[PDB]
Design a binder for this molecule. Sequence first.
Ligand SMILES: Nc1ncnc2c1ncn2[C@@H]1O[C@H](COP(=O)(O)OP(=O)(O)O)[C@@H](O)[C@H]1O
Ligand code: BEF
Ligand SMILES: [Mg+2]
Lengths: 66, 15, 390, 605
Amino acid sequence: NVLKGVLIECDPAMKQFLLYLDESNALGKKFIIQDIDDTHVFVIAELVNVLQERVGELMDQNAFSL
Amino acid sequence: AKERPIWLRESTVQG
Amino acid sequence: NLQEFLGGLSPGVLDRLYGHPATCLAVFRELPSLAKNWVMRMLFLEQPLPQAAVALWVKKEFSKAQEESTGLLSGLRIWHTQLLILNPIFRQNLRIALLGGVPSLDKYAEERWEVVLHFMVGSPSAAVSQDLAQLLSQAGLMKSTEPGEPPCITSAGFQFLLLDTPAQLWYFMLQYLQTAQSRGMDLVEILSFLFQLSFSDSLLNFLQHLREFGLVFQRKRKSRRYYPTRLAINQPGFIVVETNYRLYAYTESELQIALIALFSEMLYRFPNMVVAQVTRESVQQAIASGITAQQIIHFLRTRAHPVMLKQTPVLPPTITDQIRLWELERDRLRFTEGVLYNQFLSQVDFELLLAHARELGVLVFENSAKRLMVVTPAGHSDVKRFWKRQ
Amino acid sequence: TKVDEYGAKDYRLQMPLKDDHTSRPLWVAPDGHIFLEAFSPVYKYAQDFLVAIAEPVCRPTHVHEYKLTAYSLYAAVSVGLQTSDITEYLRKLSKTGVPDGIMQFIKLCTVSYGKVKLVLKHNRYFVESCHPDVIQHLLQDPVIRECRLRQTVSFEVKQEMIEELQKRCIHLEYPLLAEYDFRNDSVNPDINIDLKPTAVLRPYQEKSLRKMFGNGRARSGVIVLPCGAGKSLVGVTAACTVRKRCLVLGNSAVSVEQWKAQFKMWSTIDDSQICRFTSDAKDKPIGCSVAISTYSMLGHTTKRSWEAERVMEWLKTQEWGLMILDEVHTIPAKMFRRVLTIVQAHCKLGLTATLVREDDKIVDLNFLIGPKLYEANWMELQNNGYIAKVQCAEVWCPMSPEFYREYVAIKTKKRILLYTMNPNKFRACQFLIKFHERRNDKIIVFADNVFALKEYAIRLNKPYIYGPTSQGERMQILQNFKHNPKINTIFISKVGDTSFDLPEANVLIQISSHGGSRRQEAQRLGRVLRAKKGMVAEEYNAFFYSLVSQDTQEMAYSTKRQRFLVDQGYSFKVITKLAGMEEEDLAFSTKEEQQQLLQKVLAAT
DNA sequence: CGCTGTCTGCGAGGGCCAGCTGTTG
DNA sequence: CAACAGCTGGCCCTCGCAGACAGCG
Ligand SMILES: Nc1ncnc2c1ncn2[C@@H]1O[C@H](COP(=O)(O)OP(=O)(O)O)[C@@H](O)[C@H]1O
Ligand code: BEF
Ligand SMILES: [Mg+2]
């Protein structure tokens, strides 16, 4: 099949967070259409911007404000 | 004479 | 660089530029070390010489210098193979050059350039000029979108701010020269003047622009004679960087404080000191605004207080390292648009399609184990057409 | 209070600029914050004056910062300074001048010292003062009258309400000067404690005592010195000066033993006089001139055993001229503060290294013991060679994908075990121990989670210490670690983060921690901060590693707990990856091992 | 059959983080 | 209505104390 979207490349640990979001449907939909590799993932282009801030929140949680 | 390891001696950041 | 700019020019404009002798001297000066000798050799010669002879005049050692200089001059089109005689105009014009044919200024240049930077940032007290505003906006480092409202700073505008004054000015002139042709100003006239400065209606407008940036100063109600400043031909630091993400800026100028406030939080203000903290919220904002981490380290590096200079590295490594990590943290997810192909029933043909995708240069990532690959949508039609052809 | 456009406190309309500002290295904002320059020619003189009046907030290697607080000033007058002397010198040092608000503020908190004094005599506490007017003003206060026992004028006050009296006295701007006149106190017999000539106190040690004994009388307060600076010697020297019965309150059974050894090493007091009062044993505390115990033993609230009760009865019915309180920062705890009232002491000397707490009760030490007499600068001592140079680091260990899958989803407080038991983190600890042992370095490993401590201890087959381990057994491990070459690495838990003297411990590693406890971090780094034999000032003799799990809550705590150390100039270099790990035969190299570990962690709950 | 050392529960406490009210613009 | 204090519950670990059980005479 032919699927058009956006490829996301990140560290392996970050990938599990993305899959967890897809399974938990925290975004309201299964943005992941097909996992590519432990290092790369394919997701729907429409929800990339909203997913972008979601990771930023994760970085925000694991970072201290001075 | 027991020099420091590489990671402590020089930056390990990719940049 | 200046030599870079000349190379990116047509032969027609170059020969026109090789006008009065001062230009030929100016272009001659930038010949690195070797070609300067070669220019003198084939200067009194009216008969072309073989290309082999030029090659064998440089010892095998340091041979790479022989080729690079030759390529540079071929780009400058100083000589032609003629089958290597110099340009008859350049030879003649150069021969004319070769026996043929203050403290107030620097302060003025620094201040007038500063007010332009003041205007760049949201400084209410800055020089206002409609021509200057559209110049920066059309220079690719600012955008208004509403003439009534003051313009903002583009992503490249913030980076331009951090660049050192020499490179900050040179980049501006380089953009100015390129847009001079588009607006209808002859590039040769302005470009020739810059060289002559290093030692008509078009110039009058150009001279006014140079006066505005503070490079030149008439001082006599815009007389024919002008007095170029130090910056026109072509400083101690004040920031103390601490291991706890604290910058103490020994600044009296509002511009530098505006610069440092770009990527740090201002805590206290003192006449010869300002306390700023490089919080990840600020730096992430600075990176988001468009700045690049290397510029932030460089901008703090160049304006380093003398006390930190003795220390090596002058910037404590953790601060430099930490800034980079703050930059790299934002781009953990590398978004890349593409089209995925799966259900590769034809396992043998999958490699053939893989090879075809590689040949076209469209493939970005591939997974042989899972028999899948991603191609950018630009090349999606090409691969789709290939699959349809079968 | 004017705020600039860049959220900056504009202080240009408040103060002017001095013409000769280049020589003057001091700034003084109306907020009280004082930014001193460390590269100025006159730094040495300014620092001693400034540290006394203002407690340092951050002291990087270039530009220090201090803050002015009523408690910070109250320490200045006690040592001997006066409002005229402080402000005049402050104005002399100021390169911008002292704003009117701060100038009056300094004056306000200097007309309160000496008005009221607290004197203990014959097992009775009295409120002494030479001015009847101030005493009368105190009597008007309700709680002050409530705690009353039920020319110079003194009214007796019940022991059980000393704390409330002291707290209100500060709130009434009349601090009680709990100053002990030991040299003019013949009622209490003089002990045979004497400083042997072999013991020479270092300049900071002597300077701290100079503030304590500025006058003939002995001052009671909190003396702060970096871990490993030698606070034991200063505490012993204080007893030698007092020459009275001394009570030393350690933190645990390990603390008292080291206190006992230090007294013998640094004093001529005979072994018979030295005694311990701990659950392990007691060296006849009934007969002893110097008593060593722990807050837990004295502060125990439940009914005491007969063996301990007999000693407790003697302790309450005694008069102590000097009560050394090791690890003062634990005093403001709800119950440990009671130990001050339970025991009767004239002068209370407090020794500690990390005068910080995650609550706001650290300020209570001002009246519970006294003003902060001294606070040495860590970098100053580090360059002088008195404390080993440490290259702190933070090894970033990426979280295992199988673990992170569970960590992100799980939120019922089970995360701590999950990212404490990170296989990637384990490998870094395993590799680091192997490499450093090959370099003849004495490794120490800490872990708040005993589960993690046990998991790592057996897997690496290294000794581990924590709660259940008997005092003798844990004492044995330290002696083996101190001397036995075979025992090159030890594992410790929250028990041994404080008071553990391991001079040869060059390397330290931390795989877990209790939240953002700056006190825990600075204390934990202290173990390896002791001066080394063949130490060189600028050679980074010791090292500290705080293993953390990337993209995890431990990152937030790792930054939080580094706040104190960076305030003292320590830079925590980040180690994204460790070279040579791949070519090492480390544990958890297969997903099956990591898969097995994750299930066990989940089972623990 | 007694005495001392080891080990295992009761009860309490320290330190820190997170929470549902109480309060203020 | 939105936003920030604020003391306590909870959790982790630690400690002293008491009780029972095992080794020794
Ligand atoms: N003046 C001194 N001369 C020699 N050794 C000293 C001196 N002061 C301290 N030491 C040593 O430094 C260490 C101090 O340990 P300790 O007193 O427990 O420190 P702290 O209480 O500051 O943590 C010990 O090894 C001690 O012998
Ligand atoms: F500061 Be120490 F370790 F008692
Ligand atoms: Mg100690």
